[PDB]
Structure formats: C-alpha cells, structure tokens
C-alpha cells in the first residue's frame, strides 16, 4: 500500500534509534517508507524529498537526526505537512545538541519534537498514528487497543 | 463553530505566551477553545478535559505550562488525541525536559520554549487539520507563502 | 502491620533505585507498602491510589520516577499527605530531566525532593522516618540510634 | 504560641524569597520563628540552632539559601528533625544541587527554586504537622480546596 | 567594489548583533554585502545564495542566527566557501550547539555568542583574505597592533 | 614541500582526536606540520611558535585542546593568521569545558571553532582546505571532488 | 608601601567586579597594585607581568576575567606565585570552566562567579599573607569575627 | 616532621582522587596529615578539626568532597587558614554538583577551588606548595625544579 508516513534519518547510525518508529508503524498497519537523507550532507536530496512529499501522498514526516540536527527543521521548511522530530542521542552531549537543534525552531516553521533516543522514535510513530487516526476509524480502533494494552500491562508491584 | 482545537494552559501567567497560539488559530479561522487547566492544582479538571476531548469533537490539544510543566504530558496520558506541548519560560529548560522526555507510549509533540513555540503549536495543529480540510490546507499554504515572501532581503 | 508509608514507582526499572527506600523502612521497622504506578501510563491507577491514601491510613508517600517524571507531583495533586520525590537516574540526561520534572513544582503543590538515584531513595525513607518519629517515640529512638551509628562508623583515615 | 516550625535563611537578601514561607505558615496559623542563620558566616550559630531545635519543641525546619547554599544540608547534619530546603535564586541551579544532592543518611526535602519553593516548604511542613493535628489538617484541606476551586477556567 | 564577503543573518532581530561584523569589514575596507536569509523561512533563497556565492566572487560567508540557528550549517551545506558562524543570543546556547556541532564534512568556523562573535567573524574573514591581499594584511596588522596598544594599563 | 598549515595540540592524549585533521590534510595533499604545544604548560614554546608562524610560511593554524583549553586562543593572540580551534573531549564535562574555553573568545581575537572531538578535527582540516582553495585552483578541484564524493556516498535507505 | 598582591583584570568592564577585591585589600591594609592585563589582546604584557611578579616582590596574584577568561590560567602558566582566579559574569559559566579546569601542574585557586568571588580572592590572598605576617593575621581575625558577629538574627 | 598541610576528604571513596594531593606533597617533601572528615555526616568532627587547625600548626587545608560538597566551605567557616577545595567527580552529574557546591561560596568565606577530579587534587597540593614556598626558600627551589621539569618534559610531536 502507498506510504502515508515517511521516516527519514540523517545516517545509518541513526537507524538503531529510528527503527523503533518503523516497527511501531508496521505494528499499527500504517504504510510508510524509510529513507536516509541528511540536511547537512545531502541538502538537495532533502529539498527534493520534502518538496514532493505532499504530492506523493505522504501525510506525516518523522525525521530523526543527531548533533547539529537540521533534517527535521529543513524538511519542515519545504513541506506544509506535519513534521515530527526525533533527537538522536549524541556521544559527548548525550543528545542535548540534537534536542536544541530540533526543538528551538523559529516561529512559522514547526517541528513537533519527541524525546531523545528510542522512546522518542516510538513516540513519533505513535503521534503520527494519532494524527492519522483522526480520519481513519479502523486505525483509531487499533491505536485505542494498543494504548489500552500498554496501560493494562504495567505491573502492580516490583519483583526482586 | 464548535472547537476542533483546545488550547489549555497551566495558569493566567502562561497567557502572555499562549495567546500567540490563540491568535494564529483565529487568523487561520480554526475554531478553538482557550482554557486554563492545571495538572497539579486542578487534576480532576484535567482528567475530565482530556478524557472527554475526543467525544466533544476536539482533534488536537495544545498545552502550555512553565516550571515542572506537568500539563502537556498528563493531558496526553488521558487522551488519544494528538497533544502538542509548549514550554513556557531556569528559562523554560525545566519545562522543556518535563514535556519532551515523555516515555514511550505517551507522546507530546514539543515546540520551542516561549512565544514562538506557542505560535508553532498552532501552526502544527493547523497542518494536522489541513490533511482532512482542503480549504484550511489552502489557507495554510497561503500563510506559509506569505511568511516566506515577506522576509526582507536586507536589514534596516 | 498496616502500612504508614507508601513507596510508589513508575516502573520495574525504577526498583533498582527504590529498593533502597524499601530496605531502610524495613530496617527501621516502619510498616509500608510498595507498588508500581505510572503518572504518564497508568494515570487512573494513580488517581485512585493518591485519592485514597489518607483514608487507607498512609501518612507519607515516597514516589520514584525518571524522565518526564510526573508521578510524585501528580500524587501530591490528589493527596494532602506529604509526598517525597526521588528522581531516578536517566540514561541520556543522567537524571537532570527527572530532577527538574519533580522538584520544580508550582506553588501550592509540594513535593519534597531528594538526590538523584539510590542515595535519594535512602534519604526519602529517612525523611519519612523523621516525619513519623515526631509522633512515635520508639521510632524516634531507633532513628537516633541509626544516625548516631552512621556518624560513628565514618572512618578517620583513608586506606590504600 | 511556642514555635513548631523554624524558618531559617542565609541572609537578609533571602527574605524576599523566604517571606512566602512565613506568610503561608501565618495564614494556616502555624506558630513559627523566622531567623537568619549562615552556615558559612555563623557556623556555631547554626550548630546550636539545629542541635537544640527538637528540645526547643520545633517539629520541622525550613531552610533557604542561595549560592553554594550550605545552610539546609548543614542544618540537617545537626538535627534529627525533618529539614526542608529552599534554593534561593546561576539562577539557583548551584543552590539546587548543593541542597538536593545530599548524601545517603542526611536528607533535605528540597523544593523548587525561589518563591514557589518557599511557599511549598511551608505547605509541606503543614502537611507533616497535619498528621498529628486534626484542626490544622482541616485548615490545610480547606487551603488546598480553595486553591483548586479558585483556578480560573479561562484566561483574561 | 564587488563584495568578497557576504554577511547573512536569519532575521532583522539578528542585526543588533551582526552589525558589528558589518562595521568591522567596513573599517578594514573589505567590500561586502549584508543580507537577511532564513534557513527555515526562506530555504530556496538560502540554497540559491550559498550555491552561487563562489561564482559571484564571494570568498567568505559570515552567517548569524539565533534559536535553533540552522542558517550557518545549511549555508555550509551548499557552498564550498569557508562559512563562519555567529550564534545570536537559552542565551544563545541552543544556537551555539546547532552551529558548532556540525558533522564531519561540513565545517562552520564558529565564533562567540553575540556581538563579540560577530566582530570576530569579520576579523577572521579578514585574516583569511589577508593571506592573498598584502594591503589588507597590513591594515589588519595595524588593526591588531592598535587593539593591543590601546588596552589601558589600569582601570578607571 | 613547505608546510602551509600547522596542526598544534596540547598533549599526546589530544592526538587520538587531532590525527583526523592530519589525515584529511594529507588526503587533500596539503603540506603541513604537526606538533605538541601547550598554552598552560609550555607557554613560551607557544609564544615562539605563534609569533613566527607567518614568517615561516604557515597560512592556517589548527589548534586542538581540552579542559581549560587556551592553546587556540593564545595562538591567535600572537599570530595574525587564521586560527581554527578543536575542542578535545574531556572526561567529566564531555568537552563542554573545552568548547567554552575555545569558542568564547573576546572581540578582537578570533578563533574559528569546530565540533567537539574527531568530527571537529576533520572539519578544521576541511575548513583550512577551503581557505587555501581560495588561492589554489588545483586544491579547490580536489576539495570539490572530495565534498561531492561525500554527498554521493550517503546511503539512501537503512540496512538492518 | 610596595605591592605584595597584584590584582589584574581582562578589561575595564571587569572593574565593576574586581573593585571588590581592591576594596577588601585596602580595608585590611594590604599594599597592592591594580591593573588591566588581557591574555588575548596583550599577551606580551601578561607574559612580562607574570614572569617578573615574584622578583618585583609580589606574593599573590588575583586575576579576573569574563568570557573564555584565559587571563588567570595563563598568568599561572608564567609565574610560580599562587594565582587566584575570579570568573566575571553564559553568566560566567564559561569563565568558571576555563579558570577552574586547569591541567595538573598549573593551579588557579578559583573563587565564585562575580563580586563575591572578587571579595573572596582578596580574603584568600589575605589568609595566605597572614601565615607570615602576625599583624595582618590579627586584622584578618578581626575582620572574620566582625563578619560573624554582624550577621543579623532575624530578617527586616 | 609536624604537618603544615592537612588533607581532608569526605569519604574513603574520595581517596582515589585525593591520593594525588598526598603524593605530590610527599614528592615536594611537605609534611602533612591525611584524614577522612565529612561535613554532612561528621559535622562535629569537622568543627573540632577546623577550629584547632591553626593552633596545631597547619598552614593550608586541602579539602576534597563530592556531591552536595560542604566540607571545604564548612572547614573555611571555622578556620582563618587558607582552604583549597577539590571537587570529587560524582556519578550522575560528573562533578558539577561537587564544583558548584564548593566554588560558589558567599562573600566573606573563601575556598580556592581546583579542577574536578585527580588533576584538581594535584593542583591543590601544588597551590599549597606555592603558598608555603613564599616563606620557605628550599621548598621554593624544589617547586621551581618541579615546574621546570614538567615544562621540559612535554613532548614536541605526537607519536602514532
């Protein structure tokens, strides 16, 4: 089926993180595509991708990047689609450079930013799912089931 | 018209920031409601607001708060709707971390600290709604084109 | 004996930290209960727990949480009992996200916050004990003995 | 009446912050004393204050200080009573760490940086005292109910 | 004369900072152009500016921006020319990290946060140009000697 | 051939980082020299080096240092040449001490600062190359080729 | 009398801070000199100052600077004398790290950011000199006793 | 010989750091004593130590502490002697809690603070030595020799 979400990431090294978004979208039966695209190192590849996303039928972009992380924000510069950003954890600064580079977007060019690392990738997929669920009742039901099961599965007392 | 976006904020002091979200939704003719809800001072108010938002017809909730800023994450805890979070100016760094570092399973789409984040939460809510509303999508396109076109070429 | 302290924590992964509070309460012969409850993922479970704590005879709640740590503060929102918060250390941000999410509570809803990690859990139990000792002379004596023994046991010179 | 809470602060400049603790205890009719004590400039004053607090009938000590803020932890070092710490505005980040990162064995229950922390230290002290004082417990319940009920529904 | 340095900045609000770069280049008689270019609001403007800079005869680009400050790194992404970056006052700490932490392969020579960084970006651009322009190199030597010589010996 | 770039570093322990600058300069066929010089511990050695750099025919200095990192800034104090600084990652503070000590130079004494760690060393060499390419067409061609190859070699999709 | 402490600072703008060191030394009747020396703008001035300090009869150097604050560490690099460092208000956090994180072999005894650090650098210099000067040691004892005794017991 | 420097530290766990101060003082033939004393956990032991230091013939105190590090500052509260502080690196916050707790002393109560960790301990001993050298010509000569040898021993080029 035609992708409605695009997962893009700056590098192969970002995939250990962004695969969590891929897995969750697949689990919720959301057709999507997964690509490597760098703002800083393949800027023209990014311009092409972002400019044509809407016409290609994408509804949400999930963008993961670390360091001087510009991929989500430059994606958002070229598309009117909602862009969600995932700060990939960095070696020295533990993703704080990633986070501030992504979240502190200027007024007029939004990126909805999630947690540093794998939890953020998962939440970007879940946030994308909640956006798509607004217009897709079957997906809304799947998402409801998924969230309810998460809540129901939290243990009640610790084991030693 | 019936609201399709809810703007909630932790206190009156958050309004200087969150009014920028209100103004933007109004500018794009997105019907919305604007309320004060405190996660810590009015937890039952928040539970009922977030639990009932979808059945009331809301599509997106924009939540802003300062300090430990529990409001956006706790709103997300109780609604299936997309929740967008605005850290209100530790300069909002405490708010930023308590909003953006949400656990896997409970997303808050987080925007910049302060007025720009508030404006952007409204624009992000607009881009979500635009996916299903062609007239709004065109107005949003116009808004974004005007932004780009209006940036001066040189400083005064 | 009926619990007078409740130790609650967001997850099983928080137990490596919060077990230090459990152990200290047991050492001081303070009857308590120990549960997993997440603000973000089991909010209704938390509302139930916090609302009924006082009527169930609890006097102090110790709440441990990491990340966007909301469990102590939301517990405090629903109970008039004193709530002590333990920031659990986080992977990327080393518990700074935990700490600021817990300590920076708005005026009107207190959480007494302890150190990041195991030392904080121990100190939350000790602070709970000092609160209970105000009205419990036998516990006050045990606590006095415990603190005096800590002080007496600090070595006087380093060994190589 | 004889004080059951002691508010101590590192200097006169801390009063702008700590007066919020004083005001709250007075509002709840909790008898208390309010003093300046410097861990580093008046260490013997602090030792004697903290050592003798319990025998003087104090139940809780609220300590506020800025900078390296040694006062709350050193107070806890010398008393068996619960000590609550208020970092006074590095924006109070230095104070926060020197108060909250106390070693195992010597607790300080730490509140928010600034005026809100001071108010909350008094409320936390009140919630401790309420465990043994039903009339105060009812006044505290009233205070918390008024807080919740008084939050506006929408911004002005 | 035709510009050999381009000063670009993210918005009008960056001018209070970046004018210090402008003033310094003028003082050293380095022909330059001074423009507003937004990485996020005018991405095509930036792509065309940076792609064409070398063929237009520019030798160095000085780029300043605040917030997430995408401008200097994205400029470097599209030009082979040296790009120098000025974080504009999170106090410019966000800007600093988004400028200085560029990946291997895409350098931005980063200067101090604020007005001093702007002045220094111009001086650094001057020191680059001086390598090939003896008259400028002598003027730069003079500028640096005057700086050193002019520092007072004692405070007033 | 006579060196046109000088790579200086505070210590042998800085070489694991600064060797990336050395390697890139060699790859681009830029003659250079590589030395250990500490601002804090061999200040007179630094004064000699920096004062004579221009007359020795150097065009760009790359200076790497960690901690209370003063080598780039003190080099810049004594030379009119462009000085590029590389913050070497530090144990406790992860190079933040290095970064702020290098980047926050006073107005009048520039240091062009690159990323913390190896990526910064590589980028200092690349920035030096772009400076030299302004007056050296053959090097400009090599640098163009190198950057184009970097962009062309970025993969398009992640592998699992 | 001939100076036994040198106060040096990076610029005139550091004087608002460093005058507190000057005032304290004067109060304790410690002869001293007060100068501007820039590590980065006047490196030869600093080299000569620090190299010759001991032979000129100085015993302690107090150095204050802001920003990257190279002055205290570079002073220590060239003198065998004790060097005390004052970070001048990134709020002085950059200065603090560039002063305190000196490598093994080249100490700077670092004081608090700002005016309090400056006062304390002078007091620390006084405590060093007092080891060999009984009259000063008594004046310092008096100063410390007056400090302790003068702290108010309660806030106004 | 009678100690003229006292090295005090909060705990045995601080000794891995503070032993570097001990070693350097011994190398420079500076008689000293080495003790464990905690501000937070043995405050009366600290009061006794600090109050009597001057009368016992100590000239300089070196105090090492981690976390909510109060030992140097409380030592300085009770002695007129110069107190040098060494922030011991902490697990979560990498010694930043240690550093700010020690360096940010109020006006009127100085602590001369050195680097986080072992380098700071070494520098506290060296700073103590430079203080003592003011009145001790033989030690001044030893210290001169030591610093000159450090400078002379810095290598000139890196090895691979």
Nearest-Å Rg of the Cα atoms of chain B is 15
Where helices occur in G3-86 by DSSP H, the ranges are 15-27, 43-52, 71-78
Tell me which DSSP letter residue D109 carries.
E
Which conformational region is residue D83 in: left (phi greater than 0), alpha (psi within -120 to 50 degrees), or beta? beta
Q: In this complex, does chain G touch chain A, defined as having at least 3 beta-carbon pairs under 8 Å apart?
A: no
Q: CA separation (Å) from D11 to G148, H107, H127?
A: 12, 11, 31
- Comparing CB atoms, the residue among B12, B18, B90 nearest residue D152 is B12
Chains that touch A (3 or more CB pairs under 8 A): B, C, E, F
Give break positions in chain D: residue before each, C–N beyond 2.5 Å.
89
Instruction: Provide the Cα torsion D46, D50, D52, D55; round to 10°.
Output: 160
Task: Determine whether the interchain pair B101/C38 forms a contact, defined as Cβ–Cβ distance below 8 Å.
Answer: no
Residue of G nearest to F48 (CA): G44
First to last CA, chain D: 42
Instruction: Tell me the C-alpha distance between F63 and E100, whole Å.
Output: 15
Instruction: Tell me the C-alpha distance between F63 and F69, whole Å.
Output: 10
Task: Determine whether the interchain pair C155/H36 forms a contact, defined as Cβ–Cβ distance below 8 Å.
Answer: yes
Instruction: Tell me the C-alpha distance between A116 and A98, whole Å.
Output: 8
Q: Closest Cα partner for E114 from E104, E99, E130, E129?
A: E99
CB D116 within 8 A of CB C105: yes
CB B28 within 8 A of CB B140: yes
Q: How far is G51 from chain H (nearest CA, A)?
A: 13
Beta-strand runs (E) in E15-143:
32-36, 60-65, 83-87, 109-110
Instruction: Tell me the C-alpha distance between F128 and F126, whole Å.
Output: 5
Which class in CATH covers the domain with range B1-156? alpha beta
Domain boundaries, chain H: 1-160
Residue F61's DSSP bridge partners are F6, F83
Instruction: Tell me the C-alpha distance between D90 and B90, whole Å.
Output: 9
Q: Closest Cα partner for G75 from G100, G39, G111?
A: G39
Tokens 């025998």, located at residue: D55
Give the contacts of C5 (CB within 8 A, at least 6 positions apart). C25, C30, C31, C32, C33, C58, C59, C60, C61, C62, C125, C128, C132
Tokens 């995408």, located at residue: E70
Which conformational region is residue E40 in: left (phi greater than 0), alpha (psi within -120 to 50 degrees), or beta? alpha
> For chains A and B, what is the number of CB pairs under 8 angstroms?
113
Q: Closest Cα partner for C41 from C66, C22, C61?
A: C66
Written as one string, the DSSP assignment of chain C is ---SEEEEES-GGGHHHHHHHHHHHHHTT--EEEEE--TTT-HHHHHHHHHHTTTTT--EEEEEEESS--HHHHHHHH-SS-EEEEEEP-TTTTTHHHHHHHH-PPTTS--EE--SSHHHHHHHHHHHHHHHHTS-HHHHHHHHHHHHHHHHHS-SS---
Instruction: Provide the Cα torsion F112, F114, F116, F117; round to 10°.
Output: -110
Instruction: Provide the Cα torsion D97, D99, D102, D105; round to 10°.
Output: -160
- G103, G104, G106, G108: best to mutate for the F interface, most F CBs within 10 A: G103
Q: CA separation (Å) from F107 to C126, E21, F87, F103, G28?
A: 53, 11, 19, 11, 36
Strands H112-113 and E83-87: unpaired
Residue A9's DSSP bridge partners are A36, A64
Task: Determine whether the interchain pair C39/B77 forms a contact, defined as Cβ–Cβ distance below 8 Å.
Answer: yes
Where helices occur in F36-153 by DSSP H, the ranges are 43-52, 71-78, 96-103, 118-133, 137-153
Where helices occur in G1-133 by DSSP H, the ranges are 15-27, 43-52, 71-78, 93-100, 115-130
- F152, F158, F159, F160: best to mutate for the A interface, most A CBs within 10 A: F158
Burial of F86 (0-12, 13-18, 19+ CB in 10 A): buried
Task: Determine whether the interchain pair B90/C104 forms a contact, defined as Cβ–Cβ distance below 8 Å.
Answer: yes
Instruction: Tell me the C-alpha distance between B108 and B77, whole Å.
Output: 9
Burial of F64 (0-12, 13-18, 19+ CB in 10 A): buried
Give the contacts of F76 (CB within 8 A, at least 6 positions apart). F50, F83, F105, F109, F110, F111, G40
Quick one: tokens of H67? 């976390």
Length of chain A: 160
Q: How far is H119 from chain C (nearest CA, A)?
A: 19
- Comparing CB atoms, the residue among C117, C151, C156 nearest residue H41 is C151
Written as one string, the DSSP assignment of F91-114 is TTTTTHHHHHHHH-PPTTS--EE-
Instruction: Tell me the C-alpha distance between B82 and B101, whole Å.
Output: 16
Q: What CATH fold (topology level) applies to the domain C1-160? A: Rossmann fold (3.40.50)
Give the contacts of B49 (CB within 8 A, at least 6 positions apart). B6, B8, B35, B37, B75
> Which residues in chain A are closer than 8 Å to F119, comparing Cβ atoms?
67
Nearest-Å Rg of the Cα atoms of chain D is 15
Instruction: Provide the Cα torsion H84, H90, H92, H95; round to 10°.
Output: 20
């Amino acid at each position: 089926s035609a992708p409605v979400v695009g997962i893009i990431m700056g590098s192969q090294s970002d995939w250990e993180t962004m695969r969590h978004a891929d897995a969750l979208l697949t689990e919720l039966e959301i057709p999507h595509e997964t690509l490597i695209v760098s703002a800083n190192r393949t800027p023209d590849r990014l311009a092409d991708y972002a400019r044509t996303a809407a016409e290609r039928g994408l509804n949400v972009i999930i963008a993961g990047a670390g360091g001087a992380a510009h991929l989500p924000g430059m994606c958002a510069a070229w598309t009117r689609l909602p862009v969600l950003g995932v700060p990939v954890e960095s070696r020295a600064l533990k993703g704080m450079d990633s986070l501030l580079s992504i979240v502190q977007m200027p007024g007029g060019v939004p990126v909805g930013t999630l947690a540093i690392g794998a939890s953020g990738a998962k939440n970007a997929a879940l946030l994308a799912a909640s956006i798509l669920a607004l217009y897709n009742p079957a997906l809304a039901a799947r998402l409801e089931t998924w969230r309810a099961l998460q809540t129901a599965s939290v243990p009640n007392s610790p084991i030693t």
